[PDB]
Amino acid sequence: MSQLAHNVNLSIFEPISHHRANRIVCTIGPSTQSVEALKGLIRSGMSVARMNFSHGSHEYHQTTINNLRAAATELGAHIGLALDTKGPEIRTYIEYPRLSITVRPGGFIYIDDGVLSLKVLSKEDEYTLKCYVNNAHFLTDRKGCNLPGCEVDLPAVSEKDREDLKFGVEQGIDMVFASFIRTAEQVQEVREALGEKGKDILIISKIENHQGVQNIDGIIEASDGIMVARGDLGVEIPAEKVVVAQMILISKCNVAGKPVICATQMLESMTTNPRPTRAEVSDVANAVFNGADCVMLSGETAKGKYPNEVVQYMARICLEAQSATNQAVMFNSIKKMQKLPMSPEEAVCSSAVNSVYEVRAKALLVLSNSGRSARLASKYRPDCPIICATTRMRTCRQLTITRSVDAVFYDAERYGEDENKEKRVQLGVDCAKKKGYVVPGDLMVVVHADHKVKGYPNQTRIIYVS
Amino acid sequence: MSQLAHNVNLSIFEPISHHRANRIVCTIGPSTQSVEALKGLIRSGMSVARMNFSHGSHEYHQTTINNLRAAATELGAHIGLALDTKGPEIRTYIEYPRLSITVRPGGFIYIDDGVLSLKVLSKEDEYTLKCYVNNAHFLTDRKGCNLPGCEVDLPAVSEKDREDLKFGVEQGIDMVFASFIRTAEQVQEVREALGEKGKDILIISKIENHQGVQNIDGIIEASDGIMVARGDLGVEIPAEKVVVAQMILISKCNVAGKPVICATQMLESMTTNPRPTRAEVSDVANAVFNGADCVMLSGETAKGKYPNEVVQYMARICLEAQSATNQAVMFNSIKKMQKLPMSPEEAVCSSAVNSVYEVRAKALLVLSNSGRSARLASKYRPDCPIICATTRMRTCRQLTITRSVDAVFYDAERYGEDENKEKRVQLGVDCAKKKGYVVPGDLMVVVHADHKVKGYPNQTRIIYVS
Amino acid sequence: MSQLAHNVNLSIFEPISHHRANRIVCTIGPSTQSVEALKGLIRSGMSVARMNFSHGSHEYHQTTINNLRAAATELGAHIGLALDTKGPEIRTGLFKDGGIALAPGDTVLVTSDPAFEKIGTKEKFYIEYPRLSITVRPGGFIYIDDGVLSLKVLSKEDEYTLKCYVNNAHFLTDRKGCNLPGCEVDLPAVSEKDREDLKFGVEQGIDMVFASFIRTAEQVQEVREALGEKGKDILIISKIENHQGVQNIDGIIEASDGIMVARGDLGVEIPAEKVVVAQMILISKCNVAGKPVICATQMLESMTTNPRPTRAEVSDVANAVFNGADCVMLSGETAKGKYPNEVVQYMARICLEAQSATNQAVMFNSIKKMQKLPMSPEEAVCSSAVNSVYEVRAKALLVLSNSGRSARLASKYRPDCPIICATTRMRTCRQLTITRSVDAVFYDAERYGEDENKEKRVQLGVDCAKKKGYVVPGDLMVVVHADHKVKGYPNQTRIIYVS
Amino acid sequence: MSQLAHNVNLSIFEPISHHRANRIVCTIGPSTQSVEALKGLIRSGMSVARMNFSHGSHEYHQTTINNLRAAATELGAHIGLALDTKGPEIRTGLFKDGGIALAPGDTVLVTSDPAFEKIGTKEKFYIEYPRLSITVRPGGFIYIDDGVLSLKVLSKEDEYTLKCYVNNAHFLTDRKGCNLPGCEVDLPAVSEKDREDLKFGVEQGIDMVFASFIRTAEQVQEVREALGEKGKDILIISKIENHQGVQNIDGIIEASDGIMVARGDLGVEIPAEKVVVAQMILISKCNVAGKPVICATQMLESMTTNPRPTRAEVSDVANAVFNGADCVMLSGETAKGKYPNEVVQYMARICLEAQSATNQAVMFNSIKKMQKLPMSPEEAVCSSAVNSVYEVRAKALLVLSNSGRSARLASKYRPDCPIICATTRMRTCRQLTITRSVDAVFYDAERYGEDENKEKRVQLGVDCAKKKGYVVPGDLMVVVHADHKVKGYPNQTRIIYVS
Ligand SMILES: O=P(O)(O)OC[C@H]1O[C@@](CO)(OP(=O)(O)O)[C@@H](O)[C@@H]1O
Ligand SMILES: O=P(O)(O)OC[C@H]1O[C@@](CO)(OP(=O)(O)O)[C@@H](O)[C@@H]1O
Ligand SMILES: O=P(O)(O)OC[C@H]1O[C@@](CO)(OP(=O)(O)O)[C@@H](O)[C@@H]1O
Ligand SMILES: O=P(O)(O)OC[C@H]1O[C@@](CO)(OP(=O)(O)O)[C@@H](O)[C@@H]1O
Ligand SMILES: O=C([O-])C(=O)[O-]
Ligand SMILES: O=C([O-])C(=O)[O-]
Ligand SMILES: O=C([O-])C(=O)[O-]
Ligand SMILES: O=C([O-])C(=O)[O-]
Ligand SMILES: [K+]
Ligand SMILES: [K+]
Ligand SMILES: [K+]
Ligand SMILES: [K+]
Ligand SMILES: [Mg+2]
Ligand SMILES: [Mg+2]
Ligand SMILES: [Mg+2]
Ligand SMILES: [Mg+2]
């Protein structure tokens, strides 16, 4: 079916799957830092907690880290913990050494979330310029600002940035959202600051400016994932262009099989209102239609007054979108963008998803220790939940950004090695049952290795749940 | 190309066509009723002015009617004039006779744009019920409210409604937006109230509730077009379901070849802010990707403080979306949903668009007196402007809701009959030149009749602009 | 790609694939019965040997069976042995001199009087159809010899005999086949002679039957009864040589193990041009159904006497492969021809050419799209293995199959590489000779053990692929069998590197 | 739909379309030269008559031209008259008795000594190739008679003669064609004899040339020179009968008006199985290019002597249509056969069957998708007319064409209805006989006027469609010509109801 024919035949009043495939990121703040509120977030459907290191002492974030782990352990929940960097930020005389030998007479310097426009006339000396206020406004201390024109000469990883990432490694974060990534080598610089000790931590590059967009191929190649950081992006490039940026980045990550997060103002009005606007409901649903793994929440939960409800909405919208998607068409078009010949693992994951569609399997079970194979299954967009039986707790938590996945922990030190995969496969099936995805009689597709092969999955299996 | 492959290859930094295909509806109010402001709307890119008869005296709207015609004639602009009915509205004790024998103990009565929830417990007598306030609030006089559960026993066309439509016929409106259309026969009732004198006026049914959605096939069959009225819709059915409603209605109208308008809160935050939110930019762009002819503005221009700017944004977003669309894929999937055999006119319009793509024509020119053939060309979604040379001024104004069309008036009483079509064809070409769409050398596709045939187009032509 | 775009990009002077997927069925006869001639056909490309029980005694066919088995053993070949039944078939008797010549305008007497079986002349000769004079009325047609001889019926002479008018020149040979198309032929689906042939076939351990003139599912049912419990594992391939066969194709495929498009008779029973369409229907339907199909009769006709085929013959063969036939067949050409070996070599050369001219991934997908969801686990697994073959450009696909059920279900999805089938039944090796792409190797379980592991059969298969020159250490294979728990069907797919 | 899904839904006992789109080319010979026999072929289905200038004198062909013109006039038929050149062709001389018989093992002497032209024997005979002994060295092969006779060269005897070893039984007839595939043949692209033939053809007003052995665009260029200014409107159809022809197909199509897949020789010059692929390349490329293509040689071979074809012959013909050929051809079968009329009737019956088995909308779209954008206005218009045909299930498509350029460009897009071409040139009527779907009617402008309106030619076309039984009042047609202003090409499409 074409998109057109598909749309014409959508049911609207028949009920839907309740197994929500997409993942919701939440930013923690005053509204949501208490343990009790973190529990509400988890219950309401958060999978990842975002610490925004553009604000607050190491000590402030320590509280977040503590309260979360308290909430998550209490509820038995796996929750990605993410550290979002300050980056080469610019706040306010304004904080930017090379400001004058960097910005042209004629260009633009927007301030305070893009609201205040200013045009440059000439250079006064080595410090500042004299400019032209294009619309009136009032202007707090310490407000963020963009230089759409010039490419900024601040470092990808500042000194504060080293101290933050170091603190992050020490607290065992699961992933990094690196603000303002412009190139592949900047990604490499984040990788370095993390060092040997932080080498198993996911870097999600935030694309926030012109150059990030231009270098997307390279950044994707070097990162574990992308965030479409639309706040800054919408100020750095014309507002309407962001729509195209979002489509490009989401689809390229989809082809690359790397998680991608859509961010910023998705349900903005819910910062203060019980109900979202019509535009906002549609934004969330369309980020899912674009192929986004994750949709994110910022102000809405950091400092909003409806943090449970806003997440509940987000979850409800994702479910609806998910059910209005022709998922087999997604699977297929992704398959078609892959080079032949595939590696054996990739052909296996691709083919397992094929089987899922062929037998209408109710669950897909994959053994992954690093998450590689989980992400490789999810890359192919099956219409069912992916159970991942994993030996690492870090993997459970990192897999919270990947569409469709519920991770289950096999404690190998306690229960044995499981060379023949039987204990892990059993653990996965029980998980699928416990969660209501399957019952005896249903078909499952299972992915792992045969007896000989080590270091990747090379086998698919179709089994009947007992 | 798949959607996926398409998205991966979008340019973002190359420039685009500036011939905007989609149309922008504006609601007139305190911010926009003066002649000078109406001129700004026209300049900023309004094509249709919406009078909201849910508020204001006949005398208030008379001002609007006058100021508009003053602005439009001054600027030489063609502007659809639309009358949006009060309908079976409910404001506030609440205004609804059969309220108690109509609503169940257990159902819901939301009030004031969906904000205030109330659950029904039992029946007191023949007047009112006693209910349960689910969230606190403050509650002005005269606030609109919905009954999601029951199907309302108010008339499709009330008495006020007759007086309004009668006033509308007398003022020569171009089209009607009928609130709360639930069935085909309700459409028929609007048609009756309009009478013989109003028989050439377009009825655009507003879909705003459960039943409208269920009966869409029938309503489309009976109407000239649809509006996705998402304000009321988002309160009558679960918020997230509107996303699906929008997709169904837009595509069905697209298959039916009838104009469709997407409405309500598209750039809401711009009621007060100079910049739209990220969610709002995306809403507008996605309504264009859905296949909407028109996107609409309500509060944003009725009572907003940035009415020019908000329209300018809307126009800029439409252009971007339009340019990121695979328009040939749209053309094709529409063609494929039509029954064989087509009528000759339809095969002609379909085929002209085919030629447009084949020779990359820069303009498509069609002679239509009623608009039939204009709408029939636009149905097939060419990637160029459609010039329509028409003999009726009412047609120019009604064609303002149809994608891609610029209408040009041939004054037949003044200039002659033009049986061989030469004067009208010349008029159309000059129009395309005047507007910068073509220059000598370019190819145009032209649609009208051969010398013999009367009452529809049966001929296509490919010509070189001199 | 579309068919058009595909064609304009075909190469003609580039190398082609070396591994022939289609299979060749050879009819045995004077030219071909000796052990030596059999070795000849095997080396030349024969996968299947067809005994035509329309000629010869049981003893005659015993010679064929013995010689075939001796030649196959010398060469270490699996060769399917097929018994093609007489059916409800009307043949002529014998002619004085072993031949008679007929001229347009002439009359002749056609009789069912058995007295005249041996002594056919210009003036009277015998056809074996006792109810001739009741069945074919004046103004009817009797066709003879692949329908090349046209006779019109003038009158009934007596209880035995019709007077006929000769329409065209022909030289008539002993015991030709006749067609009465405008007619209800009063004849058993399975005659007494047929039951004996079949029973004989069962004792002699044939692999498959080619059942002539199959009209209905019920008749397939009859042949199945006739093989009995003892013969239950023998494949039945139904021959579609008439109107009703084509009409009832869906049911005949249901009941059957396979289909032969028997074009000789079919081209006389129905207008000649409609054979083209029936050929396309039967092949594609067998493909969709996953049952082997064979295209037969006159494919390389002129090589009965000539060391090279006509241009028409060559494209007939290629198009049969393009249509999607598993097998193409020979008749005249191997039974009594002058070039039994070269005609086979030509057929195999034409198959390979067409094979490599095919867009095989598109075949595969076509077939997939025509199957109901949900699939059985077996079918998803096989379908998906083949999917994996294309994704990794695998050099061979190995499937463990005892019945052959799983091998046929793999081959169903039309991979573009050899399929190895490790089988624990010798008979299955031989029955898989009519299935595109399959090479079978035998695993002697009695002599080597249960192999619940599957390792021994997997190794055997890999080694078979190596011996055949399909793979070397480093190459990817796709392997299909069951996990440790599941019995009765495959539920597992592995992609391995060849050690 | 996919090819598979299409097939499984083909019907075989449902009615078929009645309006034959493909065209039949008949070679004239003894069997067919009389006026009466010509009327015979015309009524039977011949659209084109091929003179083979490899046999017969100018006077002989004059008889053919005259008889054809007399028969076409009696019947009011447009028949394309084609001159098929000798080319750089090597034929044998004459044999005593008009035939000789050769046995495997034998030697024979093959000589280029003209003394031996008339007197060929078992022991020595003549082939017309003066440079024989230089060109074909020991251990080479000489093939004769559609490459059925195989001789190996042993030694050179003298300046004229080679000793050869006979590979197989054959009965050799006077003046057969020879192939030296392993060889540079020292022969003119256009001999002196050729220039005269062509010049003769030009005076006699032939419609088209079938140019033998065309190797390069330059050689097409040579034939064009040879026709001169006077012959500039004659169509050149290049025959691809060798390696270089296939190799240089893209350039030969550029230079040519069309292509014949001449399979007789081609099947000897290149491995027999590769003809299948060359056939698919040439046809599809001509389709993409919008130039007519003909498939030739041995299509219905056995009907030279038999009143019905073989199963192979029938599918050869159908598959040529499926491939997308405009025309299929006859040779032996009409020139010297016993059933000139029935062989044509069979061919037309097979064409129609295959035509109706085709998914014609899919042909059309394939071809569209293979064209560069932007198209010329002409091409968009024609492409879009055909588009309209499918959309309204039109009963006929009318196009005004004087050169035939626009008719060929309409037919290019493979509508599934008759195309009427109103033309002001009698020659165009006759040249359009090799273009699928076209029926031409003649508009006598000198006698009826300028018709800048187009009304007179539009009416003429509609009336032609009525006479032919394609349309009645009420039916939809699609009509293609120019608006009032544009000259030199069509830029306009109309859908009308037939009054
Ligand atoms: O952790 P990743 O890289 O996803 O790989 C996991 C895969 O490797 C294997 C084989 O080595 O792991 P395991 O050894 O835990 O059984 C597969 O069974 C499993 O699917
Ligand atoms: O006004 P609608 O119904 O679109 O029909 C207009 C069509 O009818 C015709 C023919 O009657 O109008 P007109 O008579 O003005 O020339 C066509 O030329 C024209 O395209
Ligand atoms: O014999 P068929 O029906 O083809 O099925 C064979 C399949 O069954 C299984 C399991 O029963 O056989 P086996 O037990 O011989 O190993 C699979 O391994 C094998 O692929
Ligand atoms: O002769 P060709 O090149 O086919 O083109 C003929 C076309 O040119 C035109 C216009 O020149 O011919 P005509 O002037 O004879 O009417 C079209 O009407 C006609 O369809
Ligand atoms: O960093 C962000 O999330 C942004 O600016 O959108
Ligand atoms: O009527 C409307 O426009 C609405 O409620 O959305
Ligand atoms: O028996 C056959 O094979 C036939 O009739 O073609
Ligand atoms: O000349 C021919 O037609 C041939 O060689 O096939
Ligand atoms: K940050
Ligand atoms: K209203
Ligand atoms: K038989
Ligand atoms: K010739
Ligand atoms: Mg940012
Ligand atoms: Mg409303
Ligand atoms: Mg038979
Ligand atoms: Mg030749």
Author numbering:
A (entry chain A), B (entry chain A): 1 to 92, 126 to 499
C (entry chain B), D (entry chain B): 1 to 499
Text taken from the publication that reported this structure:
Pyruvate kinase (PYK, EC 2.7.1.40) catalyses the final step in glycolysis, namely the transfer of a phospho group from phosphoenolpyruvate (PEP) to ADP to form pyruvate and ATP. PYK exists primarily as a homotetramer with subunits of 50–60 kDa (depending on species), each of which is composed of four domains: the N-terminal (not present in bacteria), A-, B- and C-domains. The active site is nestled between the A- and B-domains and is located approximately 39 Å from the effector site which is located in the C-domain. Trypanosomatid PYKs are allosterically activated by micromolar concentrations of fructose 2,6-bisphosphate (F26BP), instead of F16BP which is effective only at millimolar concentrations.
